[PDB]
């Protein structure tokens, strides 16, 4: 529906939609921007991520409320409505994964773009895994793991240990291990090793980069406090 609007206008309206907290609009604008076919800048990648993170975040919150009501009940209404929200969530995840596959990832050659998209791919397979129950839950989990793992491999070779994208990737991969893969020990070990190697690299950073990295290290520490 965005084929007739300029790429630059879609980006400008995505920024406006974020200010207005209209995240469904924001996501549609950035989907249109991706479909122009050009690669995305650092700023533009973050707009894409923020838009869909908010959209799927509201759907995940609603799914958990409805799933909890459904488990307490065990008419068809609660199950039917949970299924509807679940189907809508899966469609959003499939849309994001389709954008990454057509063709953001294959054209991403720099470490910072490629790791960013692969982390995204792991995240949205993780969201699919949160609601998966059938014969494909194992394959969805492995799809998330494989995307995170490739991102991890690149980030360890190409980024410093304090790089915020590398830190956020490890944070979310650790959450994957703890919440999805039933591997809490792997989750704790990744979070600790990530935190400790970042701590040793902080001396290299400017005041602004120091603030960026320590913010995410605090999230790693928050999870370790909860997990140990």
């Amino acid at each position: 529906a965005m084929g007739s609007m300029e790429r630059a206008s879609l980006i400008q309206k995505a920024k406006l939609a974020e200010q207005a907290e209209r995240y469904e609009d924001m996501a549609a604008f950035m989907k249109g921007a991706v479909e122009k076919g050009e690669e995305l800048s650092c700023e533009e990648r973050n707009l894409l991520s923020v838009a869909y993170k908010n959209v799927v975040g509201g759907q995940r919150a609603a799914w958990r409320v409805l799933s909890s009501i459904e488990q307490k009940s065990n008419g068809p209404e609660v199950r039917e409505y949970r299924e509807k929200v679940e189907t809508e969530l899966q469609g959003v995840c499939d849309t994001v994964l389709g954008l990454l596959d057509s063709h953001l990832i294959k054209e991403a050659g720099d470490a910072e773009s490629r790791v960013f998209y692969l982390k995204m791919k792991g995240d949205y397979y993780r969201y699919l895994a949160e609601v998966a129950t059938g014969d494909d839950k194992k394959r969805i989990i492995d799809s998330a793991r494989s995307a995170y793992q490739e991102a991890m491999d690149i980030s360890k070779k190409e980024m410093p240990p304090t790089n915020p994208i590398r830190l956020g990737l490890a944070l979310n991969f650790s959450v994957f291990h703890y919440e999805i893969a039933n591997s809490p020990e792997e989750a704790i070990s990744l979070a600790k090793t990530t935190f400790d190697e970042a701590m040793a690299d902080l001396h290299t950073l400017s005041e602004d980069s120091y603030k960026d990295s320590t913010l995410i290290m605090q999230l790693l520490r928050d999870n370790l406090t909860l997990w140990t």
């Binding site: 974020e18 973050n46 991520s49 923020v50 993170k53 908010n54 975040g57 995240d123 956020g168 944070l171 979310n172 959450v175 703890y178 919440e179 989750a187 995410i216 999230l219 928050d222 999870n223 909860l226 997990w227």
Partner: peptide, 9 residues
């Protein structure tokens, strides 16, 4: 546990 909040900017 918290993933990256990721909802601003």
């Amino acid at each position: 546990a918290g993933s990256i909040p990721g909802r601003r900017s």
